[PDB]
Structure 1
């Protein structure tokens, strides 16, 4: 913040709900709690300029957890190949994936 009134006075008007890893009602952690925590603890201390290069792995994991682009790519590719193989006639959907399974408790 431009003027650090809150840090100066020791109060926390709005600094406690900045990210997904902050305290949630009834201790229900948000999606990607672990990833965000890792990224932020990695990036503490070192400046932003250094973090942008030295916490990149953590940030990449975090964005993957939150948006999930690569997961969508992977599932799309798997189901695309499934469709191609099925149209060719070289694959069958197993019983458990088809609709009849031995349902587990």
Structure 2
């Protein structure tokens, strides 16, 4: 299935465009930059099942 060659090679083919809090041109922020940043930080590394709750 998912073969994570981007993580293995550190290539970043499409991860720059996945979230709206990731390095926009001219530092233009998304409408919900703080909310998505907080949600991402809170759920980082705890797994999908834990994060949902």
Instruction: Answer yes or no: same fold by TM over 0.5.
Output: yes
Moved over 3 A (4+): none
Show the counterpart of 2:47.
47
Q: Distance in 2 between matches of 1:24 and 1:50?
A: 29
Instruction: Report the count of equivalent residues.
Output: 53
RMSD of the TM alignment (CA)? Answer: 1.2
Rg larger for: 1
CA distance in 2, matches of 1:17, 1:23: 9
Q: Aligned residue for 2:18?
A: 18
Contiguous gaps of at least 5 residues in structure 2: none
Q: Distance in 1 between matches of 2:4 and 2:13?
A: 12
TM-score (norm 2): 0.92
Give how far 1:51 is off.
0.3
